Design a protein around this ligand. Structure first.
Ligand SMILES: *[C@@H]1O[C@H](CO)[C@@H](O[C@@H]2O[C@H](CO)[C@@H](O)[C@H](O)[C@H]2NC(C)=O)[C@H](O)[C@H]1NC(C)=O
Ligand SMILES: *[C@@H]1O[C@H](CO)[C@@H](O[C@@H]2O[C@H](CO)[C@@H](O)[C@H](O)[C@H]2NC(C)=O)[C@H](O)[C@H]1NC(C)=O
Ligand SMILES: *[C@@H]1O[C@H](CO)[C@@H](O[C@@H]2O[C@H](CO)[C@@H](O)[C@H](O)[C@H]2NC(C)=O)[C@H](O)[C@H]1NC(C)=O
Ligand SMILES: *[C@@H]1O[C@H](CO)[C@@H](O[C@@H]2O[C@H](CO)[C@@H](O)[C@H](O)[C@H]2NC(C)=O)[C@H](O)[C@H]1NC(C)=O
Ligand SMILES: *[C@@H]1O[C@H](CO)[C@@H](O[C@@H]2O[C@H](CO)[C@@H](O)[C@H](O)[C@H]2NC(C)=O)[C@H](O)[C@H]1NC(C)=O
Ligand SMILES: *[C@@H]1O[C@H](CO)[C@@H](O[C@@H]2O[C@H](CO)[C@@H](O)[C@H](O)[C@H]2NC(C)=O)[C@H](O)[C@H]1NC(C)=O
Ligand code: JRI
Ligand code: JRI
Ligand code: NAG
Ligand code: NAG
Ligand code: NAG
Ligand code: NAG
Ligand code: NAG
Ligand code: NAG
Ligand code: NAG
Ligand code: NAG
Ligand code: NAG
Ligand code: NAG
Lengths: 731, 731
């Protein structure tokens, strides 16, 4: 089948999926199966649509036709009336001026985003009486302007009795389109120019659950996007008796509305509100009072970020006592509340929130913060202490103290006292210049993850991190400052004292010398050593560091890549861990990789040599390794394989030679006896010349079921002559 | 003259200087003038020396032979005895094991640095009875080891009655070389392994002026170099009665000696001490006491940097009251004294030093610092407030407040109050995100320079920097954050209100759009606009921003380079300042730079088109411009000049076509009537093919006096065949 689009079959789901994503077709291809259900026609060069485009396809329930656009796109009349079983259609980014007509009554979803439709009338919506979801957003804003306000005729959406989802974002709307259908459940009116809300705007939405009114009359100070604030810097005028009929409301986003007060009368009728967004407002004084929090006992999320007032640097964080009424609160982000010093009793209202897990306090420029005050927030899961200026992922491991990008330049044992419950500690970006001695992280008895990346660490002692008995993952990446120095001791055998260490990231360290001859660990299984200098360590005639990873008995993941290795000295594979399982040598510069030495690795399965400068493939992979399964030779320089490349290599299950200079592949090197089990195989972006010398290649590539991606677009033919750019399956 | 080395003549001085710096010679060339005075033989591949090397050269006064080394250098006996008028000699970095013998008595200077001389005896210094300066440093240290202690026989240097300067730095010295000659004036004994000083070491040095004992018993914590601290972390043991005979001592450097106390008895006899270095020590407690400062009334410089105690973060700087006894103090470095808060009265001892000019307080991690306290240090010249974490060149303009790389994230008018005397304000690296309004820098009435580079500026108002009435130079470079945003207003006409602005740096801003059509200034003379995007501003069919620089009437130097300009639209030269004098378009990417429009610039003199992708030179430079004199077409892609390039063009004074693909140059395009006035001309690293078609080129290049640098090494010949790599003067 010469279809250039992927096909997926789910007989239980009776769905046949044909997707042509980013394939640059100029017309709908012929031969599309009649039993397809999901059709994708995203970014492409399709000129227009016609009734013959979907002539014989009656079992279609989905058409994805997003962002296809010399001029705009035109749709013929009765272009979709023959799609009786149609249920969803995307027409986003097509520069359509008006809603297409003739759509089947069975249509359930319709997306018209990023178009030029700025006028909505009842007559054009008469055919959408059974629609469920309508996406009419992004029709008039700074990225795609229309220079006029959105026009809604009276009761345009009223007769859409089945409508539940309606998004009118980024549409230059001035007033709420009354009257909306009573069956609405999600209303997205955010990022518009609606300046006032009427009391008769939401009388009939009794089933509404999500209401987004974000960006109307926005806070435009230092805004990286074109936004027009309201007149006289007024907030979005919402009456007190506006959210009356909203009884099933669960999400209410009021982000960036320049709000100064939040009346408690707004939350009088919405009993089951779960998420409330109030970011980018002027509620810094309201946070001190926060009377409206007493009407939200079921609130789950509360975003109050970036509510600071300009030219004011507060001495303290003024949280109200009404924050204790948030019984069900879990996530509380109060970023952008810039203030000087964080004290112990400023978080007193949150001391009894049993369901509180995340406490975000980043981007506040906090200077003084006693970390011992967090011994009361042990039940929490994330304690965010981000880019603020405090001076002396991990979420799966337990309690997390994210101290990244602070002003900590040295570590004291007393600073981390009363923090034994910590399971992770993120110290990334602090630029700590310290020679570790094994006593800094003493109170961190239960620490399991320690992030020390983007710092200045000095491995002068092998007793570094010795007191982290329960540490499992250690990240000391991007500490290249002291490792770049030559002649000072670099004790790389500091991992011997770590009894339960499992993973070690120490990459991008520019390590070129080591006093310690070997690295020792009886529990390490993953070690990333990329972006370093093993060429000097494995220099010609230098056998000192050949067995650098031999003593890592349990090591199963070695990531020595980007290490400027022009060649591997003969003998390094003898000094490799016995239990090495997956290996990576990507982006190294490897000129010649010897293959018969791979027999010493009797457990390797995923040798990775992507983005290398190799030239020759092994003579016989079976004689090389008896367990290698997942070869990755992407972006290599290979011109032709061996006559018996995959002979007797039954254990292979993955192969990758994409982006090479290969010319021809014959049968005797690729027997089907092996190819029947290959789960994956890549041979695209290479230099196949499609002459008559590859009759078997032509026959096999278009008649086997071996998975080869991009078999009709990216894997082309270089010759001869008129056969330039030919598809390997079109031969 | 085919000498590949430059020649300089000073008849009044009677020096003829020949220099072969970095010219890779294998042997001293023949034909060297007999009347030469200075000979330079720096880094090269010279195998050895012979008496015939300087056979007939009797008027030689200077020979330079630094860092020329299959094996080391070999010097034959009597290799310098024939140099009667020899006066100075350099043999640095030649791997010599012993001092060469046979040197003339008339030698005044002898440098033997970076060699392998680790043993000094009286017999080999017997010939140096008239030496004045001796540089025996860098003989045994971590970059060039010798694995043994530096050994000197007793009274080896004693009989050198004329010795004045002796540098034994980085030589693995253990004990001072008693007894030194009594006429010593400069002793550089720093960076050694001397742990003890005896009271009988400096008895005869009563004309000594500089004593360097830095790096002995060093402080090796966070040391980026291999340094060995002494036993028990002891300081350099100096007796109290050690600096007794030293009476004319002017400079005493004790940097990195791990000193804990500085007894006042040391400074009892040195009355005229001017510079005192005490950096990288443990004198944090001594600074609080500092009793020794009462014995230095003539001290000019006092370096007390990096005296912090480990794991100690002080709350304040404890400066002693004895700092007021430094009557003549001008220079003061107190960096590395890391502490929390800088208060007003902490600098009270410095309030009465009339000669104090600079006060450096960086690398201290100061958090709270009221900038209004510096209204007392008006007589100062530089107030360094660098990488410290304070939160809310210049030296030729007057008072400087260097607030670079601080923790200031917004600017208040009250913060800079009482700082009207400021002539500079360096706010670079603070990453201030602010929309300037014209009231932030209000108290800065007399500000003449403002560095605001590496920040986040938002040109939303044209009134930015309006209150800086006396501002002359403005630096807003590397503010690409908000300028990268598309659609927001960028008022580039903010310079109209600056009446006396003279220079403007606004580079690396990635500016792609501008609401303002033109830039206005009646006094701007220099404008640097590199690292921006003028290709989109001058996009095809976009005539909005063609006259962006017309209204800069007084502009005389424009720096629109690295701006991704593939081509200049026809008409931009019609939109240029009338008084434009210097112009730069380097590293842009000009595919075709027209020259006939250059007539519109009747004042241009330094059209700079280096590192571009031009192809064709103008037909006639005389018809192009009548005042151009400084072409720079370096690193261009030019293959041949036209037939009448410099025809009738007399006003040019500089020409640069280095690193091109030019092949042949004829006479009619380069008439000597023009070349007699060219001060400079570069034609190296090009692709001349030296066939028989260039007879005039061959004759002229080796018989004219037009200045052409690297005429024998870099400007080579591509052909034909055996003439590959031939020198243009060797033809
Ligand atoms: C193929 O089209 C069908 C019909 O539009 C898609 O089925 C919908 O999937 C979403 C996501 O789970 C559900 O919310 C809808 O209720 C489904 N509708 C129906 C009628 O089943 C299906 O997801 C599409 N397949 C692909 C790969 O896009
Ligand atoms: C949103 O609608 C307003 C109102 O029509 C548009 O404002 C017009 O903008 C054009 C182009 O700048 C002007 O010529 C008109 O005079 C404006 N009219 C008014 C009443 O102000 C605005 O441009 C629209 N926004 C977008 C992104 O198209
Ligand atoms: C420690 O903090 C840094 C800084 O936020 C985290 O780095 C970010 O990680 C997320 C998730 O992987 C990325 O999406 C961001 O791009 C990262 N930002 C930077 C600047 O690196 C880091 O992931 C944190 N450590 C852990 C273990 O999660
Ligand atoms: C050429 O050599 C002479 C002789 O060594 C140099 O003259 C010396 O210059 C220094 C620096 O000014 C003085 O301190 C010495 O007193 C001078 N000595 C004599 C004997 O004149 C001269 O500087 C050298 N010139 C160059 C360009 O290297
Ligand atoms: C400075 O001198 C000391 C003393 O001789 C040298 O120390 C020797 O170093 C070598 C090589 O490491 C050892 O084999 C010797 O045993 C050391 N001797 C002693 C007495 O400790 C030191 O190497 C020298 N420094 C340099 C840079 O050469
Ligand atoms: C403002 O402070 C910055 C930061 O120190 C100065 O930038 C340094 O300038 C010196 C002198 O030109 C250079 O040698 C350094 O390499 C620069 N460092 C950096 C990080 O840029 C800047 O020069 C100061 N402003 C003025 C006018 O001197
Ligand atoms: C959250 C605050 C808002 N800011 C401010 C700008 C102007 C002010 C005035 N007048 C102001 N006044 C008080 C408090 C904050 C102010 C800028 C500041 C900042 O430095 N932002 C960086 C940090 N790294 C990310 C980037 F967003 O962040
Ligand atoms: C000057 C101080 C010395 N430092 C320190 C290291 C270890 C300590 C322990 N125990 C310590 N204890 C107290 C005070 C400072 C300490 C590191 C600190 C620093 O962050 N250095 C960066 C800043 N940007 C340049 C680069 F040098 O600078
Ligand atoms: C019907 O569905 C099957 C699914 O396997 C598909 O192969 C076929 O092309 C479809 N159309 C037919 C049978 O006309
Ligand atoms: C905190 O806010 C409340 C009400 O907003 C106010 O009464 C109180 O004075 C504030 N306290 C501080 C320290 O800002
Ligand atoms: C931090 O809190 C702990 C426990 O309350 C206390 O012992 C310690 O002194 C505090 N540190 C500071 C600097 O206040
Ligand atoms: C690391 O090696 C050094 C010798 O180089 C040794 O003194 C030290 O005990 C070793 N430490 C560990 C943890 O293996
Ligand atoms: C090899 O890499 C894969 C990434 O695709 C990883 O999931 C696996 O754990 C690694 N080790 C193996 C396959 O032994
Ligand atoms: C003498 O000095 C002159 C200086 O102009 C120089 O040209 C000449 O080569 C020297 N040697 C002679 C004249 O032998
Ligand atoms: C300052 O130093 C002196 C002597 O070094 C000491 O007596 C005094 O207590 C110190 N004061 C402070 C605040 O450190
Ligand atoms: C800074 O000093 C000035 C003048 O002494 C004073 O008016 C101002 O209040 C001080 N600011 C702070 C924060 O102490
Ligand atoms: C800059 O131009 C704007 C119009 O774009 C104008 O309103 C403003 O007054 C101008 N300011 C100056 C200083 O020229
Ligand atoms: C142009 O720039 C050069 C830099 O080499 C400078 O010397 C000259 O004074 C400037 N002005 C001119 C040539 O008018």
């Amino acid at each position: 089948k010469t279809l250039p689009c992927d096909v997926t079959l789910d007989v239980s789901k009776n769905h046949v999926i044909v997707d042509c994503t980013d394939k640059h077709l100029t017309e709908i291809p012929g031969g599309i199966p009649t039993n397809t259900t999901n059709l994708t026609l995203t970014i492409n060069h399709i000129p227009d649509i016609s009734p013959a485009s979907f002539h014989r396809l009656v079992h279609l329930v989905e058409i994805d036709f997003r962002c296809n656009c010399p001029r705009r796109l035109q749709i013929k009349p009765r272009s979709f009336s023959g799609l009786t079983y149609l249920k969803s259609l995307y027409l986003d980014g097509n520069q359509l001026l008006e809603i297409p007509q003739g759509l089947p009554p069975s249509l359930q979803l319709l997306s018209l985003e990023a178009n030029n439709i700025f006028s909505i009338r009842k007559e054009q919506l008469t055919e959408l009486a059974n629609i469920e979801i309508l996406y009419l957003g992004q029709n008039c804003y700074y990225r795609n302007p229309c220079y006029v306000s959105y026009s809604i005729e009276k009761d345009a959406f009223l007769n859409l009795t089945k409508l539940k989802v309606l998004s009118l974002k980024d549409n230059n709307v001035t007033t709420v389109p009354t009257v909306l259908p009573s069956t609405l459940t999600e209303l997205y009116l955010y990022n518009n120019m609606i300046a006032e809300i009427q009391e008769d705007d939401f009388n009939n939405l009794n089933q509404l659950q999500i209401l987004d009114l974000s960006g109307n009359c926005p806070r435009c100070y230092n805004a990286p996007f074109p936004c027009t604030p309201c007149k006289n810097n007024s907030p979005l005028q919402i009456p007190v008796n506006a959210f009356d009929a909203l009884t099933e409301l669960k999400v209410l986003r009021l982000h960036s509305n320049s709000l100064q007060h939040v009346p408690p009368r707004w939350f009088k009728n919405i009993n089951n509100l779960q998420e409330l967004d109030l970011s980018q407002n002027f509620l810094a004084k309201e946070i001190g009072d926060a009377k409206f929090l007493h009407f939200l006992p079921n609130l789950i999320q509360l975003d109050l970020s970036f509510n600071f007032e300009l030219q004011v640097y507060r001495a303290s964080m003024n949280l109200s006592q009404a924050f204790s009424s948030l019984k069900s609160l879990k996530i509380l982000r109060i970023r952008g509340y810039v203030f000087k010093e964080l004290k112990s009793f400023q978080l007193s209202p949150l001391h009894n929130l049993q369901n509180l897990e995340v406490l975000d306090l980043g981007t506040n420029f906090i200077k003084i913060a006693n970390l011992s005050m967090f011994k009361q927030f042990k039940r929490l899961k994330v304690i965010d202490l981000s880019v603020n200026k405090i001076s002396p992922s991990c979420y799966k491991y337990g309690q997390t103290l994210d101290l990244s990008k602070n002003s900590i330049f040295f570590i004291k044992s007393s600073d981390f006292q009363h923090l034994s419950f910590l399971k992770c500690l993120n110290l990334s970006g602090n630029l700590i210049s310290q020679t570790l001695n094994g006593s800094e992280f003493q109170p961190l008895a239960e620490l399991r993850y320690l992030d020390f990346s983007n710092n200045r660490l000095d491995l002068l002692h092998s007793t570094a991190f010795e007191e982290l008995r329960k540490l499992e993952v250690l990240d000391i990446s991007s500490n290249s400052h002291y490792f770049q120095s030559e002649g000072i001791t670099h004790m790389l055998n500091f991992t011997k004292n770590l009894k339960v260490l499992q993973k070690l990231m120490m990459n991008d360290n520019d390590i070129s010398s080591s006093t310690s001859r070997t690295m020792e660990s009886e529990s390490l299984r993953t070690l990333e050593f990329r972006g370093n200098h093993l060429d000097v360590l494995w220099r010609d005639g230098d056998n000192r560091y050949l067995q650098l990873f031999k003593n890592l008995l349990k090591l199963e993941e070695l990531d020595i890549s980007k290490n400027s290795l022009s060649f591997l000295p003969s003998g390094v594979f003898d000094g490799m861990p016995p239990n090495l399982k997956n290996l990576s040598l990507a982006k190294n510069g490897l000129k010649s990789f010897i293959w018969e030495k791979l027999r010493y690795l009797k457990n390797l399965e995923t040798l990775d040599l992507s983005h290398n400068q190799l030239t020759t493939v092994p003579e016989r992979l079976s004689n090389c390794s008896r367990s290698l399964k997942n070869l990755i030779l992407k972006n290599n320089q290979i011109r032709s394989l061996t006559k018996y490349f995959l002979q007797d290599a039954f254990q292979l299950r993955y192969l990758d030679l994409s982006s090479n200079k290969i010319q021809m592949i014959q049968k005797t090197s690729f027997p089907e006896n092996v190819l029947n089990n290959l789960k994956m195989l890549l041979l695209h972006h290479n230099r196949f010349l499609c002459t008559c010398d590859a009759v078997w290649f032509v026959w096999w590539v278009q008649h086997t079921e071996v998975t080869i991606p991009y078999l009709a677009t990216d894997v082309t033919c270089v010759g001869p002559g008129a056969h330039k750019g030919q598809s390997v399956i079109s031969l």
